[PDB]
Every structure is written in structure tokens, then in C-alpha cells.
Amino acid sequence: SHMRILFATVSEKSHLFTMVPLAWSLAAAGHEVHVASNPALTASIKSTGLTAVPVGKDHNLHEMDSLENPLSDWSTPELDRHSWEQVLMKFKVSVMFAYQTYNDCMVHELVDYARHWQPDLVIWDPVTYAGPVAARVVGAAHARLLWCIDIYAKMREVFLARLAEQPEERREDPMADWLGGILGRYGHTFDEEVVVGQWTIDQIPTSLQLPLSLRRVPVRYLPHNGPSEIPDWLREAPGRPRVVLTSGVSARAALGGTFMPVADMINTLGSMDIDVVAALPPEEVEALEKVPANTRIVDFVPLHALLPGASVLIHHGGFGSWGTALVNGVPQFIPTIRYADWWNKGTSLHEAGAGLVVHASELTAEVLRESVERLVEDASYREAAERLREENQRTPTPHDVVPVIEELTAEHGR
Amino acid sequence: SHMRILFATVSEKSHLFTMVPLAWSLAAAGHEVHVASNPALTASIKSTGLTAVPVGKDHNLHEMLTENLENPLSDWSTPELDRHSWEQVLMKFKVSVMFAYQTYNDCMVHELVDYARHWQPDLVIWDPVTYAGPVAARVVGAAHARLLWCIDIYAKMREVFLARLAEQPEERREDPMADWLGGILGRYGHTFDEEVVVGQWTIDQIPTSLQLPLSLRRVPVRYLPHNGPSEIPDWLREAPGRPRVVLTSGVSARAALGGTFMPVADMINTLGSMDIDVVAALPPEEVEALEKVPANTRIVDFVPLHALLPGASVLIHHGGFGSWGTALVNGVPQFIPTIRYADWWNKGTSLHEAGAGLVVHASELTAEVLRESVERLVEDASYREAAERLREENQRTPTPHDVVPVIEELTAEHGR
Numbered sequence: 094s095h096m097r098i099l100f101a102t103v104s105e106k107s108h109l110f111t112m113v114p115l116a117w118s119l120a121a122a123g124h125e126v127h128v129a130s131n132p133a134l135t136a137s138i139k140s141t142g143l144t145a146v147p148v149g150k151d152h153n154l155h156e157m158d159s160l161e162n163p164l165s166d167w168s169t170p171e172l173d174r175h176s177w178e179q180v181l182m183k184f185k186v187s188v189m190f191a192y193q194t195y196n197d198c199m200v201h202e203l204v205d206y207a208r209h210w211q212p213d214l215v216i217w218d219p220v221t222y223a224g225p226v227a228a229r230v231v232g233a234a235h236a237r238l239l240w241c242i243d244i245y246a247k248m249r250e251v252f253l254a255r256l257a258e259q260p261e262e263r264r265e266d267p268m269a270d271w272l273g274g275i276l277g278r279y280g281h282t283f284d285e286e287v288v289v290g291q292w293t294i295d296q297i298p299t300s301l302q303l304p305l306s307l308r309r310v311p312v313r314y315l316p317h318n319g320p321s322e323i324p325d326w327l328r329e330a331p332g333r334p335r336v337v338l339t340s341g342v343s344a345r346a347a348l349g350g351t352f353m354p355v356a357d358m359i360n361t362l363g364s365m366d367i368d369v370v371a372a373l374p375p376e377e378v379e380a381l382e383k384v385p386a387n388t389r390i391v392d393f394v395p396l397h398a399l400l401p402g403a404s405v406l407i408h409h410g411g412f413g414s415w416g417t418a419l420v421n422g423v424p425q426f427i428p429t430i431r432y433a434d435w436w437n438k439g440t441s442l443h444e445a446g447a448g449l450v451v452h453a454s455e456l457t458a459e460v461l462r463e464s465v466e467r468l469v470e471d472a473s474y475r476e477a478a479e480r481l482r483e484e485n486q487r488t489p490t491p492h493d494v495v496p497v498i499e500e501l502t503a504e505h506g507r
Numbered sequence: 508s509h510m511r512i513l514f515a516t517v518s519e520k521s522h523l524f525t526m527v528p529l530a531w532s533l534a535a536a537g538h539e540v541h542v543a544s545n546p547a548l549t550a551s552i553k554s555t556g557l558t559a560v561p562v563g564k565d566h567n568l569h570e571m572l573t574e575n576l577e578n579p580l581s582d583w584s585t586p587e588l589d590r591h592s593w594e595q596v597l598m599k600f601k602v603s604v605m606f607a608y609q610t611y612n613d614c615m616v617h618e619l620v621d622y623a624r625h626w627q628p629d630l631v632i633w634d635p636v637t638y639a640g641p642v643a644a645r646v647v648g649a650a651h652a653r654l655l656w657c658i659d660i661y662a663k664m665r666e667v668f669l670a671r672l673a674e675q676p677e678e679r680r681e682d683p684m685a686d687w688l689g690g691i692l693g694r695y696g697h698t699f700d701e702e703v704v705v706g707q708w709t710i711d712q713i714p715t716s717l718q719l720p721l722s723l724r725r726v727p728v729r730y731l732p733h734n735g736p737s738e739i740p741d742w743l744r745e746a747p748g749r750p751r752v753v754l755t756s757g758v759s760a761r762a763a764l765g766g767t768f769m770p771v772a773d774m775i776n777t778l779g780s781m782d783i784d785v786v787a788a789l790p791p792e793e794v795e796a797l798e799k800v801p802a803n804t805r806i807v808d809f810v811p812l813h814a815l816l817p818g819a820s821v822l823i824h825h826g827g828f829g830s831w832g833t834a835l836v837n838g839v840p841q842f843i844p845t846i847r848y849a850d851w852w853n854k855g856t857s858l859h860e861a862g863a864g865l866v867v868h869a870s871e872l873t874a875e876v877l878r879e880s881v882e883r884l885v886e887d888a889s890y891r892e893a894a895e896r897l898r899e900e901n902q903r904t905p906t907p908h909d910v911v912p913v914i915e916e917l918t919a920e921h922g923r
């Protein structure tokens with residue numbers, strides 16, 4: 094029964110943190126769990142309590158005004174919106190620009206480590222395609238662990254439907270060329286399961302997730318927001334609506350610097366009859382004249398500690414914020430762009446009546462003020478958020494899915 | 508069913524690390540887990556992935572220990588009726604309460620009670636000398652249980668104490684633990700109960716065969732190594748070529764054995780003359796006071812014992828649970844030169860009697876004993892065989908995962 098389990102993620106702390114509860118659930122059941130990424134992530138892994146395995150070298154994706162253009166927009170992965178050439182082009186661009194940059198810097202070293210350590214199971218972040226390659230080379234079972242509304246597997250479904258419509262001579266697959274190429278050098282074939290896993294462990298509540306033909310194991314999202322301590326000032330319950338605003342390095346590197354500044358956001362919120370807590374990086378802190386009387390500025394505060402009894406979370410649609418607000422039943426305001434699943438994170442809540450999404454480009458002082466007022470005053474938002482909270486709470490925990498993962502590993506692995 | 512669970516530990520990283528797998532098992536089942544200690548431990552807690560709650564102020568225990576560890580009154584290694592008059596066992600409780608338990612706990616107990624009042628945990632899980640924990644629990648009606656890294660000399664010495672107490676006339680009955688903890692509880696309007704001394708139940712990481720039998724509700728749990736923040740270095744891939752021998756000296760080793768006995772530099776030189784591969788984990792001051800490094804020896808600041816000990820032949824250490832337990836789950840024979848401090852001697856003796864390892868008093872350690880002991884643990888296969896039986900015993904114990912529902916049921920039974 095006792096397994097070696099290799100977690101693999103691209104070098105994003107935000108992605109890593111989504112994997113920590115499941116990793117610990119498996120370790121707590123007696124399995125050995127190692128987490129592999131590029132050296133830049135080693136320090137972050139080590140502060141999760143989990144054993145880090147540095148692999149390969151660091152990449153230049155972070156250096157490479159905003160990241161929204163039609164070819165990077167996977168927010169509406171629908172047949173009706175994709176000709177063959179459109180979906181093919183999306184796979185070509187995503188493979189060349191994102192997936193290869195994230196993964197090629199470490200894939201061979203990951204295959205090597207897998208050969209040495211011989212994991213029974215590899216659990217991979219959904220864009221960490223180095224993971225299933227390494228698994229397949231050593232015959233390990235492997236599964237995606239999702240932080241995402243599954244635009245990746247859904248766009249792939251669209252892609253395969255269009256591929257099947259093409260004459261044989263015009264059939265082309267950038268994912269098969271890339272991953273099949275690497276697998277070929279180790280004497281292995283490509284299979285579609287290297288793209289979507291042998292199964293999918295999904296932290297997204299079923300009602301908000303795109304329906305797909307996958308072996309799907311739902312698991313409850315449990316907040317992990319990185320290294321955290323409870324400050325003294327949390328004891329003071331607020332006395333009026335508490336509104337939390339997070340801008341990270343994700344926010345800035347992707348939204349750019351072209352839209353409404355955080356300084357204007359603070360000033361708007363500073364005029365309102367609310368308590369404001371703003372988690373800001375040191376550059377956006379300095380670039381800021383006066384701090385309003387109703388506002389506290391922090392470098393970091395643990396969202397899981399802060400969001401109980403909060404009224405609103407304002408953020409860009411990353412899963413840590415989205416999920417932590419969701420489990421606390423806090424309405425969310427998501428001014429964002431069509432990058433990764435961020436727009437879907439916003440629209441899913443918008444359609445459910447649990448929060449508000451707006452395009453970052455349309456954000457003004459008036460929209461900010463009115464949106465916050467609406468999420469505080471209109472009780473239908475809290476009620477819809479509370480239904481989603483309850484849906485998450487009905488989902489089996491990491492603990493509960495451990496035996497399922499054990500059985501699936503026995504079935505699919507060597 | 509969803510619980511708030513407060514872990515409480517004295518500010519020792521070695522103690523904290525023993526609690527991490529159970530804490531994560533409970534978090535993985537959907538419960539909220541916070542870990543409280545003095546501010547000095549905050550950084551250590553944060554690197555476990557668990558949420559830290561700094562409480563109270565730091566204490567001076569380490570300064571008072573170094574400025575003054577093994578004497579008859581601090582020796583709880585043989586907690587037996589036959590070796591304790593009333594006056595002997597009373598004196599042991601008086602000194603341990605005044606010197607160790609109060610120093611560790613009084614600096615944070617009131618702030619811990621305050622936090623418990625605010626947060627309202629359903630359950631408090633406490634390190635076995637962190638008596639602030641059960642006080643805070645009792646004040647808010649939380650269920651509470653000890654989580655043991657120790658051969659349970661604490662509860663066994665208490666049993667001896669209570670047997671002798673019962674033999675005294677009622678006017679001569681005196682209990683330093685009841686005075687101390689009952690005093691604090693009294694200020695919050697609560698009574699003392701014996702369950703604040705041994706918990707409502709005991710979650711025990713020591714294999715049953717090596718643990719002292721007691722009148723406790725006992726929940727055995729498998730020890731899973733956690734050795735602090737860790738990564739796998741490249742040089743581990745190289746399987747060894749000859750017996751690998753690992754030596755740890757920590758700041759526990761130094762502060763408690765500190766400077767009467769065979770120096771670490773002499774230990775390195777002895778091992779340096781043998782046909783072995785040596786890895787020595789040493790603090791930065793031990794490293795400086797060292798002329799040459801032998802050819803067969805690698806010196807590290809830190810290396811994860813869970814990664815290092817598979818295939819290793821011997822671990823040499825002072826009897827701390829992290830080392831003991833991690834060697835045990837890897838079936839690695841142990842050589843334990845140590846003193847009668849905490850349960851360290853029992854950690855050594857337990858393995859010695861089982862034929863799985865060797866213990867010697869630190870004061871008797873020479874180059875010849877070191878060399879001969881290592882040779883014996885490498886060459887005589889009966890050591891590996893006995894170690895392997897203990898490994899198998901641990902492996903038959905239910906995991907943290909498996910005991911989660913037991914802890915849930917016990918909390919429902921005993922709590923609010």
C-alpha cells in the first residue's frame with residue numbers, strides 16, 4: 094500500500110499553495126511525498142512542511158502592456174467559437190510561449206529524478222506537462238490536480254473535435270509533437286492521457302466546473318495561503334463592513350500598469366463607511382500619498398484568518414483568493430482580464446449572483462464604489478455565496494479521497 | 508463536525524516537529540488547526556505549513572540550564588514505586604514544576620487562555636510538558652489530549668506519586684502540580700482535575716512494545732518523520748559503497764551534555780579512521796573548533812534524516828525523538844551515548860534491551876567504545892534484525908489519517 098508520490102508544479106508559489114492540503118493528506122496516510130519544481134520555488138516548498146526536490150534551471154517566463162490578446166483567450170472554449178485554424182493556433186501559441194517556457198527548463202531533470210526515485214504516482218499542476226512525461230517514462234500512475242475552471246481540458250475537447258473533421262494530411266497536434274517528441278527520446282509513445290491525466294482531482298465545486306469526459310475526483314478546497322501567523326489586531330471584530338483588497342505580483346505582471354491604479358482604488362474605498370484591509374507589495378505601498386483613516390495596509394495577512402466576517406474581497410481571480418473567499422462565504426469583486434481562468438472565475442460567480450466581475454479596463458471610481466455598495470447592501474450576494482460555501486463543504490475532503498487515489502493508482506500504475 | 512483545533516507546545520522546535528503530521532492529518536480532514544507557542548517558535552511553526560499563534564513572552568530556560576542537568580532529582584528514567592519514597596517523588600515534582608514546567612509555561616499560559624477564550628477551540632492537543640495547554644482547554648470546556656514523543660515517564664512518575672500521596676495522612680498531603688495548575692485554574696473560576704496532568708486521552712507515537720503500561724485512554728498512532736524544512740541534495744543519489752554512519756549533535760546535545768564528555772571533534776577523528784562513509788550534521792561552532800576534516804567524512808549544517816537514513820547502517824545521537832523515530836522507521840541501528848535527561852536514557856535502553864541498538868552513558872564514551880559499538884552494529888546482523896522488527900511494529904500502527912475519526916469521536920464524547 095505504501096507509495097512514493099511525486100508532486101510536480103511550475104515555479105509559481107500561487108500554484109504550489111493549491112496543492113499543499115492534498116500533498117499533506119497523502120503524507121498523513123503514511124505515503125512519502127516529494128514536491129518537485131525549479132530551484133526558484135525551493136524556499137517556498139520548504140515552508141509548506143513538504144520535502145522539496147529542485148529540478149533543472151530557472152526560466153524567463155516572468156521577464157517575458159497586458160497579457161490579454163485573442164490568441165491567449167481561452168475563456169470561452171466552445172466549438173461554435175473555434176474553427177480548426179483558431180483552436181490549432183491557440184495550442185501552437187500556448188505550447189510555444191507558456192508551456193515550453195514553464196516546463197522544458199526542468200523536464201529532463203524531472204524524468205531523471207523519477208527514474209531514480211520510482212514514484213508510484215505523480216500528481217501534477219494542470220499546466221505542468223513535465224509531470225505526466227516523467228510519470229509515463231517510469232510507468233507511474235498520474236493525475237492532474239485542478240485549481241482551475243477546466244478551460245484546458247475543454248479547449249482540448251474542442252481541438253480534438255476539429256482535428257477529427259480534417260483530412261488525414263492536414264492533421265497536426267502541437268501538444269503531441271512537443272510531448273510526444275520528448276517521450277520518443279526515452280522510447281515512449283504519446284497518449285492523450287499525458288494531456289489530461291489518467292484522472293482529474295478537482296478543487297472546483299461541480300456546479301461551477303465545465304462538464305467534460307474525464308475520470309473526475311472532486312475534492313474540497315482547503316485554504317493554504319502560504320506561511321501565516323495570526324496578528325493581535327484580528328481580535329477586534331470590525332463594527333462595519335470589512336472590505337479586503339489584494340494586488341500581488343501576479344496582478345501587476347499580468348494586468349500591467351495601464352488600468353486604474355491601486356492608489357486610486359484605495360482613495361475611493363477610503364471615502365466609504367467601511368473598514369479596508371489592503372495587502373500590497375512594497376512598490377505600490379510607497380507610490381501612495383496619504384493612507385485613508387478607514388484603511389490598514391499590510392505586506393501580507395493570511396486570508397483564511399482575515400476573511401471570516403469580511404463583507405467583500407476585491408482581487409484579480411487567482412484561486413487562493415477565490416477559494417478562500419468562497420469557503421468563507423464572502424462576496425467577491427473581480428476586476429480582471431481574460432488570462433488563465435481568471436475571467437471564468439469572475440463570470441462563474443457573476444452568473445450565480447454571488448459576486449461581480451468587470452473587465453479591468455472598464456474599472457472606474459464609480460464602478461468600484463457602486464460594486465462594493467451592492468455586495469454589502471444587496472443580501473442576495475451573501476446568500477448566493479453561502480450556497481457555494483455549502484457546496485464546497487459537502488465535497489469530500491483530501492482525507493476522504495485518499496483511498497480513492499490509492500485504488501486509482503493500483504488500477505492505472507505499474 | 509467541523510472543528511477548531513489548537514495545538515500547544517513549549518518553544519522547542521524538536522517538540523514542535525513531532526506534532527506536525529498529526530496536525531496536518533486533522534487539517535486534511537477539513538478542521539482548522541492553529542499552533543500556539545512563545546514568539547521564539549513562530550518562524551519554526553510557519554515553516555511547517557501550519558498557522559502560528561504567538562502567545563506570551565520568551566523564557567530563560569536555556570540560559571538557566573547552561574549556566575547551571577543530570578542529577579538524582581532530575582532523573583525520571585526509572586519511575587518505580589520501589590525506588591521512590593514519598594519524599595523522593597514529592598521532591599521530584601517540586602523541582603520539575605519550579606524549574607522546568609513553570610519556566611516553559613508560565614510565560615504564555617495566560618495569553619493562551621485568552622486566545623482559547625477568543626477562538627473557542629473544540630480540541631486542544633498538547634505536547635506532554637506543555638501544561639498551559641490543558642489549562643486553556645479546561646477554561647473553555649474544550650476536549651484535550653497529550654501527543655507523546657516520549658516513553659511516558661511523566662504519567663508513570665505521576666502514578667508513583669499518587670500511590671505515595673494516598674499513603675499520607677490527609678493533613679500531610681501536598682501536590683506541587685495541583686497547587687500550580689489548580690492555582691491558575693482557580694483564578695479563572697475552575698477546579699483542578701487529574702486529567703490536566705495526563706490529558707483526557709493520550710495519543711502515543713511510541714510503539715506499544717516499548718511504552719510503559721499505564722491507566723490511560725491510549726490512542727496509538729504511527730510516527731511519521733518530520734525533521735523540519737528539508738530538500739533532497741544531489742549527493743544523496745550516490746548509494747554509498749560501504750557502511751554509512753550518521754552522527755547528529757544539535758543544540759539540545761550541546762546545551763544538555765555541554766562540555767564534560769568526549770568532544771565531537773574526537774568523535775569525528777575516531778570515525779575518520781574507519782572504513783565507513785560518515786555524514787555529520789553539526790552546528791556552526793562545532794564546525795570551527797575542528798582542525799582537519801577526515802577523508803571519509805562529509806560535514807553538513809542540515810540534512811533531512813528521512814532522506815539520509817534509508818540504506819544507512821548506524822545513527823549516532825543523544826536520544827531525541829526525531830532521530831530515534833526516523834531511524835526506527837528506516838530500520839537503522841542506533842548508538843545512543845546520552846544522559847538521564849527527559850526520556851533520552853529510556854530511548855537508549857529500550858533499543859538496547861530489544862537488541863536493536865546500543866546505549867552508553869555519555870561520561871563513559873571513549874574512542875574504543877565508539878569504534879567497537881559502531882563495528883558491532885555494522886557487523887552483527889542481529890541488530891538490523893531487531894531494528895527491522897521495530898520498523899514492522901511501527902508500520903502496523905494506524906496512521907494519523909486512520910486515527911482522525913477516533914479523535915473526532917473522543918472530542919464529541921469529552922468536549923462541550
Ligand SMILES: O=c1ccn([C@@H]2O[C@H](COP(=O)(O)OP(=O)(O)O)[C@@H](O)[C@H]2O)c(=O)[nH]1
Pocket residue numbers: 106107110317318319339340341342343344372392393394395396397411412413414415417
Ligand atoms: O496578504 C495576502 C496576500 C496573498 N494571500 C494569498 O497568497 C496566495 C498568493 O496568491 P496570488 O494569486 O495573489 O499570487 P501571488 O502574487 O501572491 O503569487 C493566495 O493563496 C492568496 O490568496 C494571502 O493570504 N494574503
Ligand SMILES: O=c1ccn([C@@H]2O[C@H](COP(=O)(O)OP(=O)(O)O)[C@@H](O)[C@H]2O)c(=O)[nH]1
Pocket residue numbers: 520521524733734735755756757758759760788789808809810811812813827828829830831833
Ligand atoms: O542534520 C540534521 C539535524 C537534525 N535533524 C532533525 O531535526 C530535529 C531537531 O533535532 P534534535 O532532536 O537533534 O534537537 P535540536 O538540536 O534541534 O534541539 C529532529 O527531527 C532531528 O532528528 C535532521 O533531520 N537533520
